[PDB]
Amino acid sequence: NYFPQYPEYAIETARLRTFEAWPRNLKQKPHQLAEAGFFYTGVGDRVRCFSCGGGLMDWNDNDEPWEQHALWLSQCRFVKLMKGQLYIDTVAAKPV
């Protein structure tokens, strides 16, 4: 059924605040990861989505939150409602 997997982190602001210990040297800044529906696990570079509860880590230089989101967590209703199913389909088709 649909409702946030982490209702407490439904609001962006609440999600942002968890990145205070986020590894500064990373390309993915907190505001980015936050907007893409992610909150910080407090450990390493691991984050989880408030809606799908999916967690992504090992963030490489070439990674964009939304895209990574769409790629691995394709069934996430937050992405579909923000980016739309086309974006998802597109990201799912992209070569690299």
Reduced to 3 states (helix: H, G, I; strand: E, B; else coil), residue 49 is strand
Which part of the chain contacts Zn ion (CB under 5 A), choosing from 27-35, 40-48, 66-74, 88-96? 66-74
34 labeled binding residue: no
Q: Measure Cα distances from 13 to 28, 34, 70, 84, 86 in Å.
A: 17, 8, 22, 22, 27
Which part of the chain contacts Zn ion (CB under 5 A), choosing from 9-17, 20-28, 42-50, 84-92? 42-50
DSSP symbol at 27: S
49 labeled binding residue: yes
What phi and psi values does residue 70 have, to the nearest 5 degrees? -55, -40
76: contact with Zn ion by CB under 5 A: yes
Q: How far is the CB of 72 from Zn ion (least distance, A)?
A: 9
With CA atoms as reference, report the closest residue to 85 among 69, 68, 70, 67: 70
49: contact with Zn ion by CB under 5 A: yes
- Residues of the binding site: 49, 52, 69, 76
Which positions lie near Zn ion, rule CB under 5 A? 49, 51-52, 73, 76
